[PDB]
């Protein structure tokens, strides 16, 4: 309970169906335009929204000022929650990821090594060369879900350039929000996440604004591990609207598995009868993405057994070490927007 509200309207609103929701997630901006390029493999956001009923937005929001911008990287996906669910799944394994691998100590010359990667292209795997700053780099870019293709395409090249390959020849660089970076990381009130993450795959992790940079070192193998226990670390959320005859000041609740229901009372008052008042709840339903098995579950809750559905219960985050070693303080952030 947290005693301007309810929130007014006027705009007639059409229909107040909870089945009608929106997810937010969190996806990293440097990817943006390759999840936009029309690849012609029917993979792209527009190809999903079109197959999957959806609205998706990526945002492209310039903000400045004391705090950042909590939604600097949040894309949305809008329609029935039976779509909006499978738009989930098809954003993350058709989303692109980037590795760099370590040129130094190659013993070929490099200029034949470019030769090579010029004459024998890959369809799933673009590779780039880049220096930084005054070492050379391999760019080797994937979908997620050709993870296996990259990957070969990766170990392929080691055996080739060491005709013992060092271990900590690859570097990953992930952009996450740097308003999250309590929530991820950790805060002076927590346990220090990354340290975990570490220990468990063999990764070296350092970190020092909007994006905050979080760099992963290691094998190849390991650093797709840490990419994604980090990424089951990364916030996500599903607003809806709810009429008060449909359920089963600002409304908070937490059960014990991590999941955050919040309701903000608000009302729609016409304009053109000056009658009719219809109230109405505006939910939100938080938790860490790893867990979103347990978010549908507690939306199921919400919703009145006359709409007779089930949650869909995704399995894509079953393997988790957030499951059972995560500190529960972390799933109880009651101010984020």
Not at 272 to 287: F, H, I, T, W, Y
């Amino acid at each position: 309970h947290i005693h301007g509200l309810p929130l007014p309207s006027n705009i007639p609103m059409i229909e107040i169906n909870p089945t009608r929701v929106t997810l937010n997630m969190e996806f990293e901006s440097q990817y943006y335009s390759l999840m936009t390029s029309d690849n012609g493999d029917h993979e792209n956001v527009a190809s999903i929204m079109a197959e999957t009923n959806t609205l998706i937005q990526l945002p492209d929001r310039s903000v400045g000022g004391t705090t950042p911008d909590p939604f600097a990287q949040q894309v949305t996906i809008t329609g029935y929650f039976g779509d909006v669910d499978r738009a989930r799944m098809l954003m993350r394994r058709n989303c692109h990821f980037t590795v760099f691998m370590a040129l130094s100590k190659m013993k070929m010359p490099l200029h034949e090594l470019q030769a090579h990667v010029r004459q024998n292209p890959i369809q799933n795997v673009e590779m780039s060369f880049v220096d930084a700053p005054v070492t050379t780099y391999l760019r080797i870019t994937a979908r997620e879900k050709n993870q296996h293709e990259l990957i070969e395409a990766a170990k392929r090249l080691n055996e080739i350039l060491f005709r013992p390959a060092p271990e900590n020849n690859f570097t990953l660089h992930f952009t996450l929000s740097t308003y999250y970076v309590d929530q991820v990381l950790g805060s002076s009130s927590t346990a220090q996440l990354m340290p975990v993450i570490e220990r468990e795959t063999t990764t070296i992790i350092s970190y020092p604004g909007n994006i905050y940079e979080i760099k992963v070192v290691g094998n190849i193998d390991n650093v797709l591990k840490a990419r994604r226990y980090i990424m089951d670390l990364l916030p996500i959320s599903m607003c809806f609207n709810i009429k008060n005859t449909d359920m089963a000041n600002i409304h908070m609740i937490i059960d014990e598995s991590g999941i955050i229901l919040k309701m903000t009372p608000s009302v729609y008052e016409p304009a053109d009868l000056l009658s009719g008042e219809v109230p109405l709840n505006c939910a939100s339903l938080r938790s860490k993405e790893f867990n979103i098995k347990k978010l549908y579950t507690a939306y199921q809750k919400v919703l009145s057994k006359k709409f007779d559905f089930i949650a869909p219960q995704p399995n894509d985050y079953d393997n988790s070490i957030w499951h059972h070693s995560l500190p529960a303080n972390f799933l109880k952030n009651f101010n984020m927007p």
